[PDB]
C-alpha cells in the first residue's frame, strides 16, 4: 500500500540545474523520513541524503554536500531532490526511498537507518555538448596465448565499431563496453587473444569506426 | 565506504555467505548494519536490518551476523531467483549511512573458470602525446565478477581509473577491462606498475615496466 511515485528521467547540460520529485502514499508522510540513494552506471548504491518531513531538516553525504538540496511539500506529500551545477560525475538514477519506522527524537533513530520502500528511480543524464573523434592506440603483445588490441581514446557520441583484419579475424576478439569518463567522453578497448606463436608472423590490424566524427583508421598492432 | 567480495558463488541448494567489512565508526560501533538485493533492472529490495533481522516477507534462509568490524549475509537453499547484486549499508559516525561496493551473487551454470590477465603498457604514440593510459586486461573466468587494484611501486592508486562491468566473450565465459591514467613522467619513473585481479577461486597480479 505504501508506495513512492517518481518524475521521469532528465537529459541535461553540464552546469545546468535539475530538480526530481518523489510523490508518497500509504502512510503519514510526516511521521517518516525520506533518503535519496543513487546509483552511477554499472557502480554501487550511494547514500545522497536524507530529509526529515516533519519541519524540513535535511543532512547529507560527504561527496554530496552543497550541490544537492533536499525539500519537500507537506501538503502535497512530495519530496524533492534538486542537483546544482551539474557534472559528468552527477549521471545516475536518484531513487527516493522511505525509512522502516519514525524517529523519536533525542531517543531512538532506528527506524530511520534503511530503506524500506524504494521509488522506481530517475535517471539524471549530464551530456557532452561535443562531438570528438578518438585517438586510435595499439596495445602491443608479448599458456600459449597471447592478447593484443587497440585503445580508442576519448570520442563522443557513440558508438564505435571495431573489427580486426578487415573482418576476417572473429575467434578470441572482444570488444568492451565504452566507459564513461569524468571528463564527458568516452573510452574503449578491443582485444584479440590468439596463438602467442602467431605473433611477429601474422598481421593484426583493427578498423575503427566513429561515424559521428567520420573518424575511420586502421592501426596495424605490432609486438613490442 | 564498506568493502564486499566482488562476487561469490555456489549450486542450487547450496549456502553464500556475503562479508561487508568495515571500521569501530560504523559496523564495528553499531548494529546498524543493512543488507539490500537489486536483481538486475529492479529496484533494490531490503533484506536484512539491524545486523540480524528481516522485513516482513523475506524468508528465513536469508540471515546476518557480525563479528567485529565485519557483518555477514549468509543465504542458505539457494534458488535460481537469488541471483542479484547485494549491497551491505551501516551507520556511520556522523549522521550519515555508508554503502559497500556491492557483491554479484552467481548461481553457477557452470564450473568457475580462473582469469587470465594480460597488462598493456602506454602506447609510444600515447606517449608522443604527453598521455599515458596502462590496460588491464582480465579474460576467460566465470562467474563474471571481479575485483581490480591498481598499484605504483607497491602501493595503492586510486585516481585515474575507469573499469568496465564484466561483459560476455564470444565463448561464453566473461572479460573485464580497467585503465588507468597516468602522465608519462609517472610511466618512466617508477620501478614498476601493476594490475592486482581478486576472482572467486584466484588473484593474479600483472607487472609492467618500461
Known amino acids: 500500500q505504501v508506495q513512492l511515485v517518481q518524475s521521469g528521467a532528465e537529459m541535461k547540460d553540464p552546469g545546468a540545474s535539475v530538480k526530481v520529485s518523489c510523490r508518497a502514499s500509504?502512510?503519514?508522510?510526516?511521521?517518516?523520513?525520506m533518503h535519496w540513494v543513487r546509483q552511477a552506471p554499472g557502480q554501487g548504491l550511494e547514500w545522497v541524503g536524507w530529509?526529515?518531513?516533519?519541519?524540513?531538516?535535511?543532512k547529507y553525504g560527504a561527496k554530496f554536500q552543497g550541490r544537492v538540496t533536499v525539500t519537500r511539500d507537506t501538503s502535497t506529500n512530495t519530496v524533492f531532490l534538486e542537483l546544482s551545477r551539474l557534472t559528468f560525475g552527477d549521471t545516475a538514477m536518484y531513487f527516493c526511498?522511505?525509512?522502516?519506522?519514525?524517529?523519536?527524537?533525542?531517543?531512538?533513530?532506528?527506524?530511520?537507518?534503511?530503506?524500506?520502500?524504494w521509488g522506481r528511480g530517475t535517471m539524471v543524464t549530464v551530456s557532452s555538448a561535443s562531438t570528438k573523434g578518438p585517438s586510435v592506440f595499439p596495445l602491443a603483445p608479448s599458456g600459449g596465448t597471447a592478447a593484443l588490441g587497440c585503445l580508442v581514446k576519448d570520442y563522443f557520441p557513440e558508438p564505435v565499431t571495431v573489427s580486426w583484419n578487415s573482418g576476417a579475424l572473429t575467434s578470441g576478439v572482444h570488444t568492451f563496453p565504452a566507459v564513461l569518463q569524468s571528463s564527458g567522453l568516452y573510452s574503449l578497448s578491443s582485444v584479440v587473444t590468439v596463438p602467442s606463436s602467431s605473433l611477429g608472423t601474422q598481421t593484426y590490424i583493427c578498423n575503427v569506426n566513429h561515424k559521428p566524427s567520420n573518424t575511420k583508421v586502421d592501426k596495424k598492432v605490432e609486438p613490442k | 565506504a564498506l568493502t564486499q567480495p566482488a562476487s561469490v558463488s555456489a549450486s542450487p541448494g547450496q549456502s553464500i555467505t556475503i562479508s561487508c567489512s568495515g571500521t569501530r565508526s560504523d559496523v564495528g560501533g553499531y548494529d546498524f548494519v543493512s543488507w539490500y538485493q537489486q536483481h538486475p533492472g529492479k529496484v533494490p529490495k531490503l533484506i536484512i536490518y539491524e545486523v540480524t533481522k528481516r522485513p516482513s516477507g523475506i524468508p528465513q534462509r536469508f540471515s546476518g551476523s557480525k563479528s567485529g568490524n565485519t557483518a555477514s549475509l549468509t543465504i542458505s537453499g539457494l534458488q535460481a531467483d537469488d541471483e542479484a547484486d547485494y549491497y551491505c549499508c551501516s551507520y556511520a559516525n556522523y549522521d550519515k549511512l555508508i554503502l559497500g561496493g556491492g557483491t554479484k551473487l552467481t548461481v553457477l551454470g557452470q564450473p568457475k573458470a580462473n582469469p587470465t590477465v594480460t597488462l598493456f603498457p602506454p602506447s609510444s604514440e600515447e606517449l608522443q602525446a604527453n598521455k599515458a593510459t596502462l590496460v588491464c586486461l582480465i579474460s576467460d573466468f566465470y562467474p563474471g565478477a571481479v575485483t581490480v587494484a591498481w598499484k605504483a611501486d607497491g602501493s595503492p592508486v586510486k585516481a585515474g581509473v575507469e573499469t568496465t562491468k564484466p561483459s560476455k566473450q564470444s565463448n561464453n565465459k566473461y572479460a573485464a577491462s580497467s585503465y588507468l591514467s597516468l602522465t608519462p613522467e609517472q610511466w618512466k619513473s617508477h620501478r614498476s606498475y601493476s594490475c592486482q585481479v581478486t576472482h572467486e577461486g584466484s588473484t593474479v597480479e600483472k607487472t609492467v615496466a618500461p
Open positions: 526511498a522511505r525509512p522502516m519506522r519514525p524517529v523519536s527524537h533525542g531517543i531512538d533513530y532506528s527506524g530511520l537507518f534503511v530503506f524500506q520502500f
Open positions: 530529509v526529515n518531513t516533519n519541519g524540513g531538516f535535511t
Open positions: 500509504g502512510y503519514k508522510f510526516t511521521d517518516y523520513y
